Assembly symmetry: C2
Homo-oligomer: 286 residues x 2
């Protein structure tokens, strides 16, 4: 892949080394977009052994309409209790700070996918693709103005449009704020897998992946370690294979196709002779 | 300005000369973005005497929370009855086809700006800018999944993010489908004027204008007349001045600032020594 290396550099010349909300300093640029051909490989850029298994588990949970953290524990960890997870120290303060207890995050992404005002928008957006493919309204908004008030973290990824080529499916997200250092990697992968799963239901060839950015930012946290991801040429990229889904699958009714989807825990998604790179550390919670 | 001339050409090489919904053929590309510096002039690209007065009147109406067509007639035409308008042959079939009568379009843009689920999102997004400026959540979604069902035309322009520079205001829209031939011009202008009006309330310098595209398309309707807009160098661009707003204005409470805004009919917005070009004809209804 090529275009990720570029963006990072172009945020440098951006100009605005600026103050922000829970201030310190950031160098950041408002207004980015990139495009990926999944045809020419699976774009999920490694380095740091990407905790991808927990990225795969958040996406499935998201697709289940859940909002209780222990459910996510069950998908990742086959255990409702043992095992940290990506929303834990996020529930333990922002969500518990609203009054919630042992489980709820509030009307988070999953619920707005499966229930925005009673519109089950996952199940029915896979029908427009199945049925009016070259339609343009095949969108799933997650920002619910009227329910922002009850959520732990209002969605950073809030919107997306699908486009049908002549045999390819394309997805495009809009993200409000991104941490290119340690965010944008987990997000490239989540919708890359979503255009895979939906292309397997619609039996379309996964096509291109486009990303629209709002406040793309790099934090002022001693950038020399992020810097290191410059100048390299990716050569051997990852194959992109899902398992456990029964042969009848692509003919099954949309509502019956997610039923089976949701039965896959993260072992079922795997990559062939995927580029190694080591894992260093250092993180900050979004 | 420069980047508009480019995009048009780059849709040509796109590949997909394709069938669509109310089919014929189109050449179209999914995934565009452009950026405009209003500092270096008012970007509204002329040619065809842009029926800009009706673009200015739709925006104010939008900002009034209305959804009744005659109200728009009042703003443009100072008359609840005499004078065509941009949503007329749109109400006269799509809206009347739902049952509506003499006036309603259904829960159109204006209502989702002023009332999405009871969130009055114009009035309160101008407070975040006034008050937490370097916040990232200062978004106004118009796509309401749960109320698409009652609208004449579900919004083509559905989303937008504002960003505060250090003294500039920036806006970015996402548009589901665009008719670059005869659409995208009326839209460049509508949010260009919206970053003006909101920069005058927030007393910020209008900054950059960015546009995210979904299905950017040119219709297969004998393109040689659109072609003509290639190869020219814009030189003298339009000054961008609003009138009638009382000197106290920039200190007035947000809710009191729109009150005055809405009192301006389209005569109050005007451009200095703005590039002439003639007006030919030919249109198709979106």
């Amino acid at each position: 892949m090529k275009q990720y290396q570029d963006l990072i550099k172009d945020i440098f010349e951006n100009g605005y080394e600026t103050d922000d909300r829970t201030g310190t300093g950031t160098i950041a640029l408002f207004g980015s977009k990139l495009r990926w051909d999944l045809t020419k490989g699976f774009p999920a850029v490694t380095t740091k052994k990407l905790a991808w298994k927990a990225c795969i588990a958040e996406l499935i949970w998201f697709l289940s309409g859940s909002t209780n953290v222990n459910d996510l524990r069950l998908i990742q960890h086959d255990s409702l209790i043992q095992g940290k997870t990506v929303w834990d120290e996020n529930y333990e303060n922002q969500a518990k700070d609203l009054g919630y207890h042992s489980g709820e995050l509030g009307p988070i992404y999953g619920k707005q996918w499966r229930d925005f005002g009673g519109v089950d928008q996952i199940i029915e957006v896979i029908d427009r693709i199945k049925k009016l493919p070259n339609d343009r309204r095949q969108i799933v908004s997650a920002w619910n103005p009227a329910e922002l008030k009850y959520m732990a973290l209002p969605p950073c990824h809030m919107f997306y449009q699908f486009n049908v080529r002549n045999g390819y499916l394309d997805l495009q997200w809009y993200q409000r704020s991104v941490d290119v250092f340690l965010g944008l990697p987990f997000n490239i992968a989540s919708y890359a897998t979503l255009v895979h799963i939906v292309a397997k239901m619609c039996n379309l060839i996964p096509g291109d992946l486009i990303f629209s950015g709002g406040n793309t930012h790099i934090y002022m946290n001693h950038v020399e370690q992020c810097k290191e991801i410059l100048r390299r040429e990716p050569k051997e990229l990852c194959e992109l294979v899902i398992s456990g889904l029964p042969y009848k699958f692509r003919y099954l009714s949309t509502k019956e196709q997610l039923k089976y989807v949701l039965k896959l825990r993260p072992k079922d998604f795997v990559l062939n002779n995927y580029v190694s790179h080591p894992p260093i550390k250092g993180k900050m919670a979004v």
